Amino acid sequence: XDXXX
Amino acid sequence: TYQYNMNFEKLGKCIIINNKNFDKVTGMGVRNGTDKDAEALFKCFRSLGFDVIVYNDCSCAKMQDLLKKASEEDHTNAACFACILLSHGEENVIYGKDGVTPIKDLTAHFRGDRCKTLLEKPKLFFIQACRGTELDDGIQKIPVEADFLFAYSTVPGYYSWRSPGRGSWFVQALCSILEEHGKDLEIMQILTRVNDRVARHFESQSDDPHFHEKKQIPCVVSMLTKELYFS
């Protein structure tokens, strides 16, 4: 959730 | 004399590829926050004077076909061209919803020998995607490849951070700087200020110490031969 690509 | 000619009917076309949802076979989660990014981008680039079209959840074949057709259009009355890629990524490669495709294969369609109507005109590519798996811990006749510019969200090998609630760092910084100075600054000044903003204003927060207090620095690759203003 709360993270990158 | 040292600037790109902006004396055309239209500024140009801006293609925004917003990949949020991905096939299960790719094993990648939903890119929450990318819609905020895409909308902000659409407004900023519309404000600059672009004719912006947003495509969502595209496949590799779809992205290739898109940029192909765009390369085959008539940009005679266009000052420039712009493409934005919002997706998952690895080094030299970007994700469609089906899988992966090489970025160079996306941008090659607009090469001088392939897109004659954009000859001597700037081709801009903004890529919000990861370029590897490494982390920043921080500390306290004319060439066919000419007139290209790539604005990557991060340096090769490193991650590109994205806040599900606020959007990705690079895109939101870029959008702010474009809101304020998009028309009175040269493109490299803008992207430099974007570098500064992303570098300083951001520090990741996570319960996993592996992703706690981490940093990011964007990357600009310029093959431009003139200065670029959007006015």
Instruction: In whole angstroms, give the CA distance from residue B65 to residue B24.
Output: 23
CATH number for position B134: 3.40.50.1460
In chain A, which residue's Cα lies nearest the Cα of B166?
A2
Name B139's Cβ contacts closer than 8 Å, sequence gap at least 6: none
Q: b/e for A1-5, b at 16 or more Cβ within 10 A? A: eeebb
Residues in chain A: 5
Please indicate whether, in this complex, the C-beta atoms of A2 and B163 are within 8 angstroms of each other.
yes
Query: How far does A1 lie from chain B, in Å, by closest CA?
Result: 7
- Which is nearest to B73 in space by CA: B18, B16, B15? B15
User: If you ran DSSP here, which 8-state letter would residue B215 be given?
Assistant: B
Task: Please tell me the total count of domains within chain B.
Answer: 1
Residue B206: φ, ψ to 5°: -155, 150
Burial of residue B75 (CB within 10 Å: 0-12, 13-18, 19+) is: buried
Ramachandran class of B17: left when φ > 0, alpha when ψ lies in -120 to 50, beta otherwise: beta
Q: Do A5 and B211 touch (CB under 8 A)?
A: no
Query: Of how many residues is chain B composed?
Result: 231
How far, in whole angstroms, is CA B135 from its chain's centroid? 21
What DSSP character marks residue B200? Answer: H
According to DSSP, the β-strands at B93-95 and B89-90 are antiparallel
Distance in Å, alpha carbon of B40 to nearest chain A alpha carbon? 18
Nearest in space to B128 (alpha carbons), one of B53, B48, B35? B35
**In whole angstroms, what is the distance from residue B174 CA to residue B195 CA?**
9
Give this entry's resolution in angstroms: 2.9
- Residue B170, chain A, CB below 8 Å: the answer is no
Q: What is the CA radius of gyration of chain B?
A: 17
Which residues 35-74 in chain B show a CB within 8 A of chain A? none
Residue ranges making up the domain that contains B88: 1-231
